Symmetry: C2
């Protein structure tokens, strides 16, 4: 599966290092909410701009996480939307925005993108559960509400 | 196929917007060298640290590229190693470091397929003179 590979890279190179680092830095109950779109149109610039405005309205700022953990890593600085003064984070998975290019009538490809989205989150959720991270890693809708 | 997905995301979300932006910014002949291993032991933390110290020694520093282009993206600020005072850049593809976790030397098969697709995307976008591949010693 192509989406499984993208989920593995997203988890192993971003979500897992971020939450592991934050826990070591002292935060005992940090939360990373991962945006979970369903439909192809949620990957458009219009929906991305909506979420970016919403992050600003709710006082999130793009912030760095410096990595000090073990592990082969070419990047040592992660960037995550972080709520002001609060141990909550948000991410729109950028990798999902490559799915249309990968798949490439125009309507048939959009439905294939939506199946890849579903499989992406199928694998990502599996990885979260297998690392017992459900208390820290959750999924957010368009309104940054859990589930 | 999984290696193709990783290469497409690496090209579409990083290499292609980076080179397009810096050209739009007025860099006429910028160069990006992409590290290309082929042995599994080149993805170890020891080899990565040698590349990092080498980049430092050759006066490369992480440089910010602000994306103002057309296209949907959730991440608008890229970071890329840039040689001091020169339109020359280097990247170790971080996405390669997930191939072991996705999977003996079947990883090296995936690495070869990653670079076949990546090299294909460079040719199809007429970027063969701007984007090349480098070894552990930052040589083409
Ligand atoms: N918000 C956020 N998301 C991240 C970060 N690092 C990774 N991600 C996400 O994991 C995916 C795979 O990461 P990778 O580091 O293993 O491969 C990356 C990496 O090899 C490269 N790349 C992208 N942005 C980069 C960057 N800022 N610096 C260095 N390399 C970068 O492009 C590949 C695909 O990027 P992507 O945006 O499509 O998907 C990321 C992205 O969705 C991060 O630091 N912040």
């Amino acid at each position: 599966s192509p989406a499984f590979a993208l989920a593995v890279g997203y988890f192993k190179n971003f979500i897992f290092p971020a939450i592991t680092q934050i826990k070591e830095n002292g935060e005992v109950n940090p939360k990373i909410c991962i945006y979970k779109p369903k439909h192809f149109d949620e990957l458009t610039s219009t929906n991305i701009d909506m979420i970016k405005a919403e992050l600003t309205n709710k006082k999130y700022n793009l912030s760095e996480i410096n990595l000090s953990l073990k592990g082969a890593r070419a990047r040592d600085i992660l960037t995550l939307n972080k709520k002001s003064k609060i141990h909550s984070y948000f991410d729109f998975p950028n990798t999902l925005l490559s799915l249309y290019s990968y798949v490439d009538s125009e309507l048939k490809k959009k439905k294939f993108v939506e199946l890849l989205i579903e499989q992406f989150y199928l694998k990502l959720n599996e990885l979260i559960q297998e690392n017992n991270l459900t208390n820290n890693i959750t999924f957010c809708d368009k309104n940054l509400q859990g589930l």
